[PDB]
Amino acid sequence: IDVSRLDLRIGCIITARKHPDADSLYVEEVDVGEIAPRTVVSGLVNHVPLEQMQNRMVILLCNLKPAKMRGVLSQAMVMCASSPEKIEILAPPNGSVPGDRITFDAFPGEPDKELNPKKKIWEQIQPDLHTNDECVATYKGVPFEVKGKGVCRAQTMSNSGIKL
């Protein structure tokens, strides 16, 4: 089981607001290159000011089974570097386009249509997901890259885990 099972894509947060029925969460509408934006619910209120959530490029895990979070069905998850004392949104390289896929020549494969909730194979992948010494996001040391644009990275969190 390697990273090829995950469907990682670039997205642009079109709109972001406090979740109407869960003030500790944000609800974002994200353009991920599909016909319609995906609704995403993120617990980033205590880590990123709302102003900095607007029109922001991010990396999303797109094949997790959608789940509700207070009457709000979350359809993807924003990839972040994290620790018990901080969370940082991973930044795609300049010029990334919604829908761009993060793939690895070292780990060839097509992502699952939907990660089976039962089994949770992402728990087996997460341990090898971390930013390196230079804050670049990696899977087993191989950088998250957008073909022809560059690598994805956290702002200050080095050697930090990336949760799924």
PDB file of C-alpha atoms in Angstrom, residues 48-129:
ATOM      1  CA  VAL A  48      -5.644  30.362   9.939  1.00  0.00           C
ATOM      2  CA  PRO A  49      -7.545  33.661   9.938  1.00  0.00           C
ATOM      3  CA  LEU A  50     -10.585  33.702   7.658  1.00  0.00           C
ATOM      4  CA  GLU A  51      -9.041  36.434   5.507  1.00  0.00           C
ATOM      5  CA  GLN A  52      -6.166  34.110   4.590  1.00  0.00           C
ATOM      6  CA  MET A  53      -8.556  31.336   3.553  1.00  0.00           C
ATOM      7  CA  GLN A  54     -10.006  33.362   0.651  1.00  0.00           C
ATOM      8  CA  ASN A  55      -8.959  32.481  -2.917  1.00  0.00           C
ATOM      9  CA  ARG A  56      -6.169  30.299  -1.579  1.00  0.00           C
ATOM     10  CA  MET A  57      -4.514  27.467  -3.518  1.00  0.00           C
ATOM     11  CA  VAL A  58      -4.356  24.192  -1.588  1.00  0.00           C
ATOM     12  CA  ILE A  59      -3.796  20.473  -2.020  1.00  0.00           C
ATOM     13  CA  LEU A  60      -6.827  18.267  -1.361  1.00  0.00           C
ATOM     14  CA  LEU A  61      -7.272  14.562  -0.725  1.00  0.00           C
ATOM     15  CA  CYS A  62     -10.234  13.848  -3.010  1.00  0.00           C
ATOM     16  CA  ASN A  63     -11.091  10.164  -2.703  1.00  0.00           C
ATOM     17  CA  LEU A  64     -12.043   9.874   0.967  1.00  0.00           C
ATOM     18  CA  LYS A  65     -15.646   8.812   1.578  1.00  0.00           C
ATOM     19  CA  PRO A  66     -17.711  12.019   1.966  1.00  0.00           C
ATOM     20  CA  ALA A  67     -19.026  12.579   5.497  1.00  0.00           C
ATOM     21  CA  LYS A  68     -21.307  15.116   7.177  1.00  0.00           C
ATOM     22  CA  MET A  69     -20.020  17.572   9.779  1.00  0.00           C
ATOM     23  CA  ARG A  70     -23.132  19.291  11.206  1.00  0.00           C
ATOM     24  CA  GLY A  71     -25.565  19.036   8.321  1.00  0.00           C
ATOM     25  CA  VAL A  72     -22.643  19.788   6.027  1.00  0.00           C
ATOM     26  CA  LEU A  73     -21.274  17.022   3.820  1.00  0.00           C
ATOM     27  CA  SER A  74     -17.502  17.408   3.475  1.00  0.00           C
ATOM     28  CA  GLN A  75     -16.305  16.169   0.076  1.00  0.00           C
ATOM     29  CA  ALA A  76     -12.512  16.506   0.392  1.00  0.00           C
ATOM     30  CA  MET A  77      -9.802  17.321   2.916  1.00  0.00           C
ATOM     31  CA  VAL A  78      -7.207  20.105   2.854  1.00  0.00           C
ATOM     32  CA  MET A  79      -3.692  18.699   3.280  1.00  0.00           C
ATOM     33  CA  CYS A  80      -1.739  20.260   6.144  1.00  0.00           C
ATOM     34  CA  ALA A  81       1.470  19.847   8.105  1.00  0.00           C
ATOM     35  CA  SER A  82       0.548  19.370  11.768  1.00  0.00           C
ATOM     36  CA  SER A  83       1.719  18.850  15.327  1.00  0.00           C
ATOM     37  CA  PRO A  84      -0.042  19.071  18.696  1.00  0.00           C
ATOM     38  CA  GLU A  85       0.833  22.779  18.784  1.00  0.00           C
ATOM     39  CA  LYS A  86       0.180  23.944  15.209  1.00  0.00           C
ATOM     40  CA  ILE A  87      -1.348  23.305  11.780  1.00  0.00           C
ATOM     41  CA  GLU A  88      -0.163  24.783   8.472  1.00  0.00           C
ATOM     42  CA  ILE A  89      -1.880  24.516   5.091  1.00  0.00           C
ATOM     43  CA  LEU A  90       0.469  23.037   2.488  1.00  0.00           C
ATOM     44  CA  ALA A  91       1.139  25.435  -0.376  1.00  0.00           C
ATOM     45  CA  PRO A  92       1.267  24.285  -3.997  1.00  0.00           C
ATOM     46  CA  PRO A  93       3.996  25.837  -6.193  1.00  0.00           C
ATOM     47  CA  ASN A  94       3.181  29.042  -8.074  1.00  0.00           C
ATOM     48  CA  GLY A  95       1.118  28.551 -11.200  1.00  0.00           C
ATOM     49  CA  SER A  96      -0.742  25.423 -10.088  1.00  0.00           C
ATOM     50  CA  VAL A  97      -4.193  24.915 -11.660  1.00  0.00           C
ATOM     51  CA  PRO A  98      -7.274  23.446  -9.952  1.00  0.00           C
ATOM     52  CA  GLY A  99      -7.391  19.789 -10.867  1.00  0.00           C
ATOM     53  CA  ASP A 100      -3.627  19.325 -11.243  1.00  0.00           C
ATOM     54  CA  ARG A 101      -2.760  15.901  -9.836  1.00  0.00           C
ATOM     55  CA  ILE A 102       0.085  15.137  -7.427  1.00  0.00           C
ATOM     56  CA  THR A 103       1.566  11.853  -8.662  1.00  0.00           C
ATOM     57  CA  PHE A 104       4.832   9.985  -8.116  1.00  0.00           C
ATOM     58  CA  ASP A 105       6.947   8.267 -10.767  1.00  0.00           C
ATOM     59  CA  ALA A 106       8.365   6.187  -7.920  1.00  0.00           C
ATOM     60  CA  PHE A 107       4.890   5.013  -6.869  1.00  0.00           C
ATOM     61  CA  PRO A 108       2.902   4.425 -10.095  1.00  0.00           C
ATOM     62  CA  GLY A 109      -0.782   3.622  -9.868  1.00  0.00           C
ATOM     63  CA  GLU A 110      -4.331   4.915 -10.134  1.00  0.00           C
ATOM     64  CA  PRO A 111      -6.083   6.154  -6.978  1.00  0.00           C
ATOM     65  CA  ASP A 112      -8.999   4.260  -5.460  1.00  0.00           C
ATOM     66  CA  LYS A 113     -12.386   5.522  -6.657  1.00  0.00           C
ATOM     67  CA  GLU A 114     -13.152   5.810  -2.940  1.00  0.00           C
ATOM     68  CA  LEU A 115     -10.916   4.922  -0.009  1.00  0.00           C
ATOM     69  CA  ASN A 116     -12.787   2.160   1.785  1.00  0.00           C
ATOM     70  CA  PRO A 117     -13.838   3.607   5.177  1.00  0.00           C
ATOM     71  CA  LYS A 118     -13.526   0.103   6.583  1.00  0.00           C
ATOM     72  CA  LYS A 119      -9.813  -0.831   6.588  1.00  0.00           C
ATOM     73  CA  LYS A 120      -8.654   2.799   6.516  1.00  0.00           C
ATOM     74  CA  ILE A 121      -5.552   2.228   4.386  1.00  0.00           C
ATOM     75  CA  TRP A 122      -4.714   5.917   4.789  1.00  0.00           C
ATOM     76  CA  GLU A 123      -3.632   5.128   8.348  1.00  0.00           C
ATOM     77  CA  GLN A 124      -0.897   2.969   6.836  1.00  0.00           C
ATOM     78  CA  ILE A 125       0.203   5.720   4.445  1.00  0.00           C
ATOM     79  CA  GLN A 126       0.042   8.664   6.850  1.00  0.00           C
ATOM     80  CA  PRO A 127       3.110   7.464   8.839  1.00  0.00           C
ATOM     81  CA  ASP A 128       5.310   7.991   5.766  1.00  0.00           C
ATOM     82  CA  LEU A 129       3.817  11.402   4.967  1.00  0.00           C
TER      83      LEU A 129
END
